[PDB]
Amino acid sequence: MAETLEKKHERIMLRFDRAYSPQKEVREKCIEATRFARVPGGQWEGATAAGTKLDEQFEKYPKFEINKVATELNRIIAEYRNNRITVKFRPGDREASEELANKLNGLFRADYEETDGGEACDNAFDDAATGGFGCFRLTSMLVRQRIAIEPIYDPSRSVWFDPDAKKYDKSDALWAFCMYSLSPEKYEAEYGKKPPTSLDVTSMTSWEYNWFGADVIYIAKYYEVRKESVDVISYRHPITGEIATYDSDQVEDIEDELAIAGFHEVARRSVKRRRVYVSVVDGDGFLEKPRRIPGEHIPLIPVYGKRWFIDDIERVEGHIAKAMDPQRLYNLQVSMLADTAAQDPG
Amino acid sequence: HIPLIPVYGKRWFIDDIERVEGHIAKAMDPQRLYNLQVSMLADTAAQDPG
Amino acid sequence: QRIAIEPIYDPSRSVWFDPDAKKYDKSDALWAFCMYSLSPEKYEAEYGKKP
């Protein structure tokens, strides 16, 4: 039953390991594809330092790079950004359907415009088209309460889902992860200076890349869905409609209804409901204790370029993976032509 | 807000670092190789006229 | 009082942002820098010759 937070922590760690084990190589391919397509020097990684003594020196082999695999991807990105798309609500065959739909897509449009919806969509589509996996988040912020759209950076190494979820939208997911990097100064700015920093281990980066700063700390948010027993109160005010069932989170004392326009009536019906909790964890303990978010689904929305289910593991592809070998062979051919031509001029 | 407004040509977030690129980065090697080829042709041509 | 628009020269070696900011427009930035060059005569004209 694990009353202590300590006993719940190693369960979270085990779940993270179980989720990380299978989906390890596909994300490696996605990261390699993005790095190959965008990083200025990423087309020769894995052989950055290669050469022979040449009589008391160690000349490195000449390695040139002519990027030709990004034009078609840029064309795709331009085609998308020319005609953006957004969720549209359609009415039904009722008397108030049109007005309901108008209010719904007015409120949704306001939320999308007064927040980072455009940034989230652009980044998600860019990552999906380049590597194959993209995501963005849909959380709630207070400014009294509102719903905000936020982007996710490094989805390939930052988003991990339940291994038993096989749908495109991960509807049958029971828990989920969202990792992000942080700086130590902000680490003591938030939380506390008292406990030393500890970061989750993934052995993911430094994979054929230069690293200079060990000043990054990996912190993960963790989402669960739980079925719990909750009792509701059915107010039966005769005036302004009689039947109105509300949960026990709002009470005549919690919110000052004062039974002015509300009657107790029946308040014994308890039903099981689906609720979602969020928390912030690290490699040692709980940074923030679990708290329930106002929703029913995991607020993570994954975006895929091409996705298939081949052997008990989902596999993704973008638009760069298929052209790696001809490009990295063309570069070698160009280099071996250039040095040989320069060897003997006349 | 901070009144600094950045403008990026092409921008991405790859490995915990913001990366930017314009329109000259990709074609540096072909140009700086073409120049060398032209020079090594010119000097060889000037060497022996007839 | 009035709001004005001014340019920044050499952004790549003059503009630096908070390393923990990750957005395109850097909304989530807590501090920033803006460097520029100056001549000794102008540095004396403003401020003072004392320092």
Next chain:
Amino acid sequence: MAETLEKKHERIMLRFDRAYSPQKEVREKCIEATRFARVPGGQWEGATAAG
């Protein structure tokens, strides 16, 4: 609490150092690209004196 301005100054210096540290090898590429495209002698730079 950073009572004195001298106490406030080295915090600013440290923040400048922390901001300059990560974003270094990208601005070099940007400056190199600008110099290569615009400066009359920038396409052969780095090997000006070779013989």
Next chain:
Amino acid sequence: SFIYLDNMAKSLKRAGEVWLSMAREVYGSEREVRI
């Protein structure tokens, strides 16, 4: 040039938002009162 123009447009949007936030304390708040 489409990507450069799009990035410029989305930077101009942010600049306009900053100007909107700035203008309230300089030019004052706006009220609609004529009746």
Next chain:
Amino acid sequence: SQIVLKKFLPGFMSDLVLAKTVDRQLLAGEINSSTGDSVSFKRPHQFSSLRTPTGDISGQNKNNLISGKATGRVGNYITVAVEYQQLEEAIKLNQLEEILAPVRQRIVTDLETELAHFMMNNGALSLGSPNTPITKWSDVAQTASFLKDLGVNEGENYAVMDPWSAQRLADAQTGLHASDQLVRTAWENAQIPTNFGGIRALMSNGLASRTQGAFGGTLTVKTQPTVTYNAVKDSYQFTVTLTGATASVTGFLKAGDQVKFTNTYWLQQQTKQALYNGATPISFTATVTADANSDSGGDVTVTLSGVPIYDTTNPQYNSVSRQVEAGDAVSVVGTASQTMKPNLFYNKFFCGLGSIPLPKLHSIDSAVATYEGFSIRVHKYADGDANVQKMRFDLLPAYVCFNPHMGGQFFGNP
């Protein structure tokens, strides 16, 4: 035997508590290009009163105004340099960054060993017999009790103990009778709380060690020293000669030994009254600063940090019950030549620590690496055309000792 992993194997490293606990506030950005290589801080003033029954005595013997200083300066360079064939190094090492990780550690580890030696060499107060380790609660509580008895309030006190010694305190804590939180924490993590007995306790594996140094004979003072405030108002150091020693021994007194004067006791620095340690008064102690030899006839001249001022014309600055005079009986703590790792206790305003920024060498490529607030300047050059490239790392520290009478060493007592 050819497939070699690109990921390095794990290594070893110590911890940092001294640099974090010492005062890094006063000595910061003050040794600039204009102040020189040293700078001094001021010292508080003290006054003494008169007891007379008359009022129209407007002309009498008044007090005096003497101003003191505490001067801090810069230390030697912390330099690590490697010579190597850069091509052979770069065969399999990208950007030469594998070197960076175990180097910042050596520079950071060495500064901490230097701070410990200075704190041990300049600290004055001593407690307990060096032979006995720390086993109980009183061994830790005594430092806080003594610091409170001296009269220091402004600041916060600290103590650092070896890891094996803490295992013992946690074992004792597991024996409590009513604090279930404490018992559970000690049983699970073997972790003592933050404030232990009125002083903040720290556990650290990286800590300096010292040797006693051979000595023998009933030592005693030969010539009366001068301990007036005018003489010792700038350093709190004084020199003294001792007789009755061994014939001729090299290294007679090492740096860090505690010499105890039997008949001179400490005073409560405000009320100027003696100190009672439950059953016996507390005697005055001083710390050897530099190594002292012994010549024929058994005469040793030594310099000690911590002064027992008994000025007779400026009584307001006294810090001892009586004046040290010829024929007094002195002793030294510990045994002949044993080696030990001392355990330290100190106030916030005892020793400082500062860094001097270093400018870039002309026409030589370089970089700056930050590591918990310490900036290391790295330079690279290729002098000589034998493919011998060289890289160097530099850091320049600076130390100051404010008041030697607010810190020192302590051990366990039976």
Next chain:
Amino acid sequence: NNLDSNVSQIVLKKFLPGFMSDLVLAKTVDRQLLAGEINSSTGDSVSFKRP
């Protein structure tokens, strides 16, 4: 060589902390009975009765 005349030997205007004590007896002794009793008319001393 010999740059010592360029620099100055300064002393910061900040005092190091010192030692102080506490007072408990004056707050606990009786003071209400001997409150202004010794005046110009009374003289050097004044007396109280016994039970």
Next chain:
Amino acid sequence: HQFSSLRTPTGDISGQNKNNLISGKATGRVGNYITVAVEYQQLEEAIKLNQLE
């Protein structure tokens, strides 16, 4: 790697010594196969072997 430091009042390292890059490697090897083998007849399969899994 492990290194050592030098001390100098001014930083002159003209006549000092400098550290070298000594490389050390730890080796790992394979062991021996673990093999479990069984055999049996087709007639036994037909008339006697049930619940083989």
Next chain:
Amino acid sequence: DQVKFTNTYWLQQQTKQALYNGATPISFTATVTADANSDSGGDVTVTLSGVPI
């Protein structure tokens, strides 16, 4: 089997200062890797893992 060298002490690997468990320094220990045999004269040659460099 485990062999203890009485008069050689461990070291904190980074600091290089000796290790003391209270008032008794810790003694270096090593482990026998292969079976050894004793010949006449009380001489045995052994191979130990972990070295006192």
